[PDB]
Every structure is written in C-alpha cells, then in structure tokens.
C-alpha cells in the first residue's frame, strides 16, 4: 500500500494568485511564475516530509536533495497537470494561470515552455498512469545528488531502490512488455536532466539580475537559489541515470 500512501500525500492543487487584469509583460509573467514556485515549494517540502523513508535521511541530505531537485519536481508535475487538463496542448501551471501560445511568446522563454510541453506530450504518447506518475515523481527527488555523496548514503540507496521497485509494481502484462515499459519510463526520467539544465540556467540568469530585470522572486526561493546556484556552477551535483 506504499502507493496508497503516495496517493494520500500528493499535494492539493496550488493556485498562482495571478491577476489577469495586469498586462502580461515578460516581467509580470516571470514574477508570477516565481510566486507560484514559492507556493509550490512549501507544498513539495510538506510532501517530502510525509514521504516514507525521507525522514530517515540526515537533515542535511533532505535539504540538499530538495535543493537540487525542486525544479525537476515542479516541471514534471506541470507535465502531468498539462496532460490531464489539456492533453498536453498548453502548460497548466495553475488553475488561474494557464499558458497558451500568447503567454509562451511574451514569457521570453518559449523554447523552455516547449521543452516542458514535450514532457506533457510524452505522458500522452505513453499514456502514463497516475500510479506510474507518483512513483516517478519520488525518483526525481532522488536523482540529483552531490558528487561527494550523502550523509545517509545507505539509507538513501535503500529508499531509491524501494521506489524503483514500487514503479515496477505500478507497471498486468507480460515480463518483456513490463521491461519495455520500464525502459521507456526511465528514458523519460533521464530526459528531465537536460530540460532542467536549461530551466535552471534561465532561473539563475533572471535571479542574478532580478532587480535590474524587475523579475521578482519570493524570499524562500531567494535563499534556496542563492545557496544552490554556486553549488551547481561548481559542478557539485551529478544525476543518477537509468540509461547510457
């Protein structure tokens, strides 16, 4: 019933608190997304703590893991929402902030938007199930680690394997077909890294010139990014891939 749990701790929908009466300038669009991100951050943290096995890890690791994977978690959840609500035609950031063709253009990050829409499309092509999605999401939280290692390395390794097995369980069907499914689903997981690399590059770029660009970031994000940025630029993080 490990999934029964994943299903119960799955965060409730988060609204952007977006004001459509405002002009959709690049500044307002990005600042609004950053606000949504701050609100989603709170939800991912509360979700992580309720994750069977996450609390067994050292606090330092818990901090490090969320710090390195928050962008991937949110982009992936965005992929799912866009899949269930628009069959992947639009980015369902939040019920009150749906990105259509127009907002993608005025956002100044059209390409990153398409990259994110591509994840949504994969969900469509593969008809990913809700259970597969929940398991994959957890794996994401456990796929970007410090090159030097975690403090609860052993506790970490066990947890990761358990969720990988949980994914297999979600995956009736014959053995070969289940193998092919696993291969394809883990290919999707590995693809997140390139997408995230690009998402993070723009995030760091807008973060550095925040005031000069008039792109706002909520306090919680400012602290996370401020600490994370140098670590990423220093190549301190590495992905845990499923494929060559």
């Amino acid at each position: 019933f490990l999934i029964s749990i994943l299903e119960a701790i799955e965060p409730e929908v988060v609204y952007a608190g977006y004001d459509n009466s405002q002009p959709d300038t690049t500044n307002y669009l990005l600042s609004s997304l950053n606000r949504l991100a701050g609100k989603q951050m709170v939800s991912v943290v509360k979700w992580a703590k309720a994750l069977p096995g996450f609390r067994n890890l050292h606090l330092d690791d818990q901090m490090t893991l969320i710090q390195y994977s928050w962008m991937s978690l949110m982009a992936f959840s965005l992929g799912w929402r866009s899949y269930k609500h628009t069959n992947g035609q639009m980015l369902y950031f939040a019920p009150d902030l749906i990105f259509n063709e127009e907002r993608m253009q005025q956002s100044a990050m059209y390409d990153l938007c398409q990259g994110m829409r591509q994840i949504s499309q994969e969900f469509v092509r593969l008809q990913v199930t809700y259970e597969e999605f929940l398991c994959m999401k957890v794996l994401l939280l456990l796929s970007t680690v410090p090159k030097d290692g975690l403090k609860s390395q052993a506790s970490f390794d066990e947890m990761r394997m358990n969720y990988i097995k949980e994914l297999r369980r979600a995956i009736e069907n014959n053995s070969s077909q289940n193998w092919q499914r696993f291969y394809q689903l883990t290919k999707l997981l590995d693809s997140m890294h390139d997408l995230v690399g690009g998402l993070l590059q723009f995030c760091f770029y807008t973060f550095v010139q925040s005031q000069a660009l008039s792109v706002e970031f909520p306090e919680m994000l400012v602290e996370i990014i401020s600490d994370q940025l140098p670590k990423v630029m220093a190549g301190m993080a590495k992905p845990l891939l499923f494929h060559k």
């Binding site: 951050m41 709170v42 943290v45 509360k46 992580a48 703590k49 606090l59 818990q62 901090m63 969320i66 710090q67 306090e219 919680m220 602290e223 996370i224 401020s226 600490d227 994370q228």
Partner: peptide, 10 residues
C-alpha cells in the same frame, strides 16, 4: 536556505 531548513525541521 533559512526558511527551508526551518520548514523541514518541524
């Protein structure tokens, strides 16, 4: 990440 740490340890 002050706000985050405080949120994770409670």
């Amino acid at each position: 990440p002050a706000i985050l740490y405080a949120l994770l340890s409670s």
